[PDB]
Amino acid sequence: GTVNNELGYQLFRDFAENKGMFRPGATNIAIYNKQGEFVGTLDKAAMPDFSAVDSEIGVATLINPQYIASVKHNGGYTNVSFGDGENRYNIVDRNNAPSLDFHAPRLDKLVTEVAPTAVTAQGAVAGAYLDKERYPVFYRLGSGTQYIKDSNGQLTKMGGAYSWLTGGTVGSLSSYQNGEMISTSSGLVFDYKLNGAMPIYGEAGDSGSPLFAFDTVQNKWVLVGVLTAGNGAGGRGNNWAVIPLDFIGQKFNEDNDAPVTFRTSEGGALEWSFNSSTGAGALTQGTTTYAMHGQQGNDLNAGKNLIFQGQNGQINLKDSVSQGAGSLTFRDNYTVTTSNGSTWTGAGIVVDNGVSVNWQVNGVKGDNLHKIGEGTLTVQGTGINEGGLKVGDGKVVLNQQADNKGQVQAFSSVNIASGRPTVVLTDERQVNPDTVSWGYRGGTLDVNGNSLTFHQLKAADYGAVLANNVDKRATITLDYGYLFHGQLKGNLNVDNRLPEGVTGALVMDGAADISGTFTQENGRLTLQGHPVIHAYNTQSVADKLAASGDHSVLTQPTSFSQEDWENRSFTFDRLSLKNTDFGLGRNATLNTTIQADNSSVTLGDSRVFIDKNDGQGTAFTLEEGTSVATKDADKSVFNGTVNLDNQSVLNINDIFNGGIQANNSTVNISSDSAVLGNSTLTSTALNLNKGANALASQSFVSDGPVNISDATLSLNSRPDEVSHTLLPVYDYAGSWNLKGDDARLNVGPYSMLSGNINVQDKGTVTLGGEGELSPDLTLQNQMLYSLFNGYRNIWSGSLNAPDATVSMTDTQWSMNGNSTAGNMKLNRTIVGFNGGTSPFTTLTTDNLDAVQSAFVMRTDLNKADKLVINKSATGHDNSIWVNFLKKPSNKDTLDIPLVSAPEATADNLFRASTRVVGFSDVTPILSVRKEDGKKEWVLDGYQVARNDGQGKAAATFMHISYNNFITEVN
């Protein structure tokens, strides 16, 4: 083909192979220049499926499951391949048109891998292919001699014919030779308005290559013709022969014997005698008889097709029949029996849609039965069948019976291809599991309740489905690293129990949606997304094009750095992991309960894999590399619960939504979008590392450390959102331990916090923020909300945070030992000392801003708790409550400094409480003096308690309701 040098070559390559943006059904594909300018759009119909075209050189196109279409001057080729190339179909009659440069070759077998294309509804009608209303667009592809043309018509040859495929658009076509031939100036490769978005001209070797058109009357793509010639290299135009409808009609029809009808009236069965050496046979239901022809010597063309019909036919074979290229077609249900061990072979069987054929006739060693049509073939022979099976459409039920030696075998191998068919196993004796392979676009193997063991999964791609569709659960035991491209579906468990000390990864870039459990023991498991397969060339062709300044040419189907990946989704009841390394890479979603024992689990693992043979068939070449999702759309997702036990490690680097139940393990979070639900950690550190951002959205209980280094942990609510559906939660750690300047511990309203808080560096701890409870609260939700005593936040622990900024609103802080803070902000918060009396407790801060807040210090008349402020104290309307732990007497005196602050601080920033805490029934009296470089508030007397209609005094500071505290301040 010849293309213009303005568009990137890879477009034409990908277009021809239905890859990348050119997958079948892709719509509105926009096309751009090398200089990035818009040239046009593929918007007249969805991208067509080119898979009826032969995959290696595109000189022939399947127009019937048994006939290709090409030009007769293509006299050499003797076979073609479809899809991924892993097949071979041989010509048995070139079927040349005698006046037209055109042929319609009959093949040896029925093709299973692909559907044939539809052909023009019109055929050789003069002028038809100029009506843009009916046919808006024409596409072609071929592998002729490949050039690029510049502006000034100069030609550079990139390769010979039959090296690779190129495809593109073609302009509307005029007819000549009475409508038998059509043509267009397709060589005008820079004229987009005339020739479409990707103009291409056919060259030597593009002979026979197809032309397709979108037919808006039928709303579908249609093969119109096949390419015959052009005006030489870089020439002005091409000619095509229009598919000749009367001719291909004659070619099909002449292969059919007269149509065989069963009537029950004529009696017993149709008896099928076949004389080997003449290659002839008959089908006799006692009186009536039916001609049948088969193979003759090495001549497969001597066979003719049979078409069987009539209600509930029945046919018995007396002789082994060798049908050659004759095929069978069942338009009605039939059963085909044999007591002689008569075999049958031929081109294939077609079972019409809604038809079932019980087939009890074995094959023959080294042959392959081909099955197609959308109906069902029930295979019920007796004994070992040594034949093979290639299925391509509808259903095949394997129900082979045992012989008198008890041996059974439906087939020696089974190949499932095209995406249309299903193979059903009645039991586990029909086939050796390792001999089942899935070709181009796959199909389903339905294990139908039987549990099985596979040492391999020979699967070309994502259309390969292993499944179980009945409610008798079944297990698939695997036992080969290893790559599976396919899908696992339905009522299954899957066991991947490796023997000890192995380090081979089982890799899945396909998908899974199963109702049971997936078990890995030892090794690696990697579930991941799958980069889009693209066309590629050799390194020499990519260099030649780089030489000419086009860098678009690829040298492998998939790579680690490409932007286009397919999303994959994995769903199991349970993912059980023992002694494994488990990874969920980019472009994958996992929905499971993970049950891990001595395993690592990396959610958002950057180690992922490509298959160097991806798209070339069932052979694969794994390579491991690095690919990190940077865009939310490509990021792994995990939903569910992670149970960790016995030295397990969980690394959260992806979009995570789950509860954690952990014992004797570790969790490390570096993801900036993790949401932890209800969690319990026992001997399990929880590390949030740099850049991480996590929400504990429900209760969180650990007996251990929660380490926040330059990360952000929010409990109950985030500090960039106000919620009106909060529930009261627990939040317990052995310790909350921040480090680094950027660390943040945000504790939302209705969190009951417990555990010491330790801050290294200038991190920030914030207790309280906006948010309202849900109107709908369980009883436990009510019983817990009650324990808050009118406060939004309760914390019990001690604060070691000398350079930190700490902030508390509407909080009740029970401080259990000496505490330090760099910068403290209190707003309507009550702080109660609750360390020793052995010596009392100190709170030391550098800077305290305090507003409508209170401190409750305890005394024994000799000593007390103490607030120390070193550098600045600001705010207003704070109260010192004194819990006199001994009833003071006026025959005895008081001199205890309770708050000390810079000398310049206002006097009334602190005032004595108006109310009592404790048993003493007295209020404090507080005097200001300056002393050893700081203003002091001194407990130097007491006062008989005023009864201000509040009821009894709070017994300790824990009994100071918020309403008590707040109305005292006011």
How many Å apart are CA 716 and CA 652, to the nearest integer?
Answer: 19
Residue 930 is which amino acid? K
> Residues touching Ca ion: how many (CB under 5 A)?
2
Q: Is 810 in the site for Ca ion (CB under 5 A)?
A: no
Question: Would you count residue 93 as binding Ca ion (CB under 5 A)?
Answer: yes
User: Three-state DSSP class for 52?
Assistant: coil
CB neighbours of 25 closer than 8 A, spacing ≥ 6?
46, 47, 49
- Using the contact rule CB under 5 A, the part of the chain among 95-103, 163-171, 336-344, 563-571 near Ca ion is 95-103
Q: In Å, how far from its chain's centre is CA 480?
A: 24
Q: Compare residues 55 and 95 and give the one whose CB is closer to Ca ion.
A: 95
Supply the minimum distance, in Å, between the C-beta of residue 258 and Ca ion: 17
Least Å distance, CB 208 to Ca ion, is 18
- Based on CB atoms, which residue is closest to Ca ion, 253 or 298? 253
Closest CA to 258 of 326, 210, 317, 322: 326
**Closest to 799 in 3D by CA, of 808, 790, 810:** 808
Give whichever of 301 and 593 is closer to Ca ion, judged by the CB atom. Answer: 301
Q: Tell me how far, at minimum, the Cβ of 95 lies from Ca ion, in Å.
A: 5
305 vs 900, which CB is nearer to Ca ion? 305
Which region among 18-26, 57-65, 90-98, 893-901 touches Ca ion (by CB under 5 A)?
A: 90-98
Residue (255 or 614) nearer to Ca ion, CB:
255
Closest approach, Cβ 93 to Ca ion, in A, equals: 4
In terms of CB distance, is 107 or 738 closer to Ca ion? 107
Shortest reach from residue 352's CB to Ca ion, in Å: 23
Q: Which residues contact 529 (CB under 8 A, 6 or more apart)?
A: 509, 565, 566, 567, 568, 585, 586, 587, 588, 634
C-beta closer to Ca ion: residue 95 or 798: 95
Of 94-102, 138-146, 230-238, 319-327: span binding Ca ion (CB under 5 A): 94-102
Q: What is the DSSP letter of 325?
A: T
Q: Which is nearer to Ca ion, 95 or 796 (CB)?
A: 95
752: closest CA among 793, 709, 724? Answer: 793
Distance CA 452, CA 24 (A): 35
Q: Which stretch binds Ca ion (CB under 5 A): 93-101, 397-405, 653-661, 720-728?
A: 93-101
Q: Please report, for residues 26, 27, 47, 169, 754, the alpha-carbon distance to residue 43 in angstroms, rounded to integers and kept in the order given.
A: 9, 6, 9, 12, 62
Provide, rounded to whole angstroms, the least separation between the CB of residue 209 and Ca ion: 23
Q: Find residue 703's DSSP bridge partners.
A: none
Give the nearest distance from C-beta 255 to Ca ion in angstroms.
6
Residues 6+ apart with CB under 8 A from 659: 641, 642, 676, 677, 678, 679, 698
CB of 301 to Ca ion, least distance (A): 7
Build a one-symbol-per-residue string for 462-481: x at contacts with Ca ion by CB under 5 A, - elsewhere: --------------------
Residue nearest to Ca ion (CB): 93
Sign, CA torsion 896/902/905/909: negative
Among 86-94, 387-395, 609-617, 962-970, the segment contacting Ca ion (CB under 5 A): 86-94
CB nearer Ca ion, residue 93 or residue 605: 93
Q: If you search the block for the tokens 């048109």, which residue do you land on?
A: 97
- Specify the length of the chain in residues: 970
Distance CA 682, CA 357 (A): 62
Select 93 or 101, whichever has its Cβ closest to Ca ion. Answer: 93
Cα 146 to Cα 209: distance, rounded to the nearest angstrom: 14
Q: Minimum distance from CB of 324 to Ca ion (Å)?
A: 12
Q: Least separation, in Å, of the C-beta of 104 and Ca ion?
A: 9
Q: In this complex, which beta carbon is closest to Ca ion, that of residue 93 or of residue 446?
A: 93
> Which residue's CB is nearer to Ca ion, number 93 or number 108?
93
Region of 79-87, 92-100, 380-388, 822-830 interacting with Ca ion (CB under 5 A):
92-100
E-assigned strand segments in 270-394: 270-275, 280-285, 288-293, 306-309, 315-317, 321-322, 327-330, 334-337, 344-345, 348-351, 356-359, 368-372, 376-379, 388-391
What does the alpha-carbon distance between residue 968 and residue 953 come to, in Å, rounded to a whole number? Answer: 12
Q: Cα dihedral sign for 716, 722, 723, 727?
A: positive
Active-site residues: which are they? 73, 101, 207
Radius of gyration of the chain measured on its C-alpha atoms: 41
Give residue 802's identity as a one-letter amino acid code.
P
Q: What is the closest distance, in whole angstroms, from the C-beta atom of residue 106 to Ca ion in the complex?
A: 6
Instruction: Return the biggest CA–CA distance within the chain.
Output: 137
Element (DSSP H or E) covering residue 158: strand 155-159
d(CA 294, CA 276): 9
Distance (Å, whole) CA 968 – CA 318: 108
Query: Which residues are paired to 576 by β-bridges?
Result: 519, 595
Query: Position 942: which residue type?
Result: Y
Residues 6+ apart with CB under 8 A from 949: none
Instruction: Find tokens 């992991």 and name the residue.
Output: 577
Answer yes or no: are the C-beta atoms of 498 and 554 closer than 8 Å. Answer: no
CB of 73 to Ca ion, least distance (A): 19
C-beta atoms surrounding 688 within 10 Å: 27
Q: Which is nearer to Ca ion, 93 or 550 (CB)?
A: 93
Binding of Ca ion by 108 (CB under 5 A): no
C-alpha distances in Å from residue 178, one per residue of 125, 127, 241: 8, 9, 11
Q: How far is the CB of 70 from Ca ion (least distance, A)?
A: 15
User: For residue 758, what are the contacts with CB-CB under 8 A and spacing of at least 6?
Assistant: 735, 736, 737, 738, 800, 801
- Sites of contact with Ca ion (CB under 5 A): 93, 95
